[PDB]
Design a protein around this ligand. Structure first.
Ligand SMILES: O=C(O)c1cncc(Br)c1
Length: 119
């Protein structure tokens, strides 16, 4: 029932993501010189360094907010990909499955901690 535990759990999950080879295209903002039409398709760029910086700055109030930004990294890849069989998009799908499998307990524990507090 530790209401604050999610933060370190997210830091550790981000450390695992940064070690994953599948995160390489998503660690830093998409290089707009390499993909000149990127902002014509993508309204809100997102990447894992931005997520980590937002977390470390104390600018997420909950793991659900972090989860929305991570999910945006994946939806941006799905929206920008010219093919659902592309290399970078295929990396995003694997990384998304890894993230979802690991964030589930973080969200459950946080929500449980809030419920206990309210009780
Ligand atoms: O070239 C691609 O397949 C691709 C997919 N998702 C994001 C980016 Br940037 C590129």
């Amino acid at each position: 029932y530790d209401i604050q535990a999610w933060k370190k759990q997210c830091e550790e999950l981000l450390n695992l993501i940064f070690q994953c080879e599948d995160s390489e295209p998503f660690r830093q903002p998409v290089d707009l010189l390499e993909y000149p039409d990127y902002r014509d398709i993508i309204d809100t760029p997102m990447d894992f360094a931005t997520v980590r910086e937002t977390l470390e700055a104390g600018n997420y109030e909950s793991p659900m907010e972090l989860c929305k930004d991570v999910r945006l990294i994946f939806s941006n890849s799905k929206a920008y990909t010219p093919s659902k069989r592309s290399r970078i998009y295929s990396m995003s799908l694997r990384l998304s499955a890894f993230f979802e499998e690991h964030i589930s307990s973080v969200l459950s524990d946080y929500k449980s901690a809030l419920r206990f507090h309210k009780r």
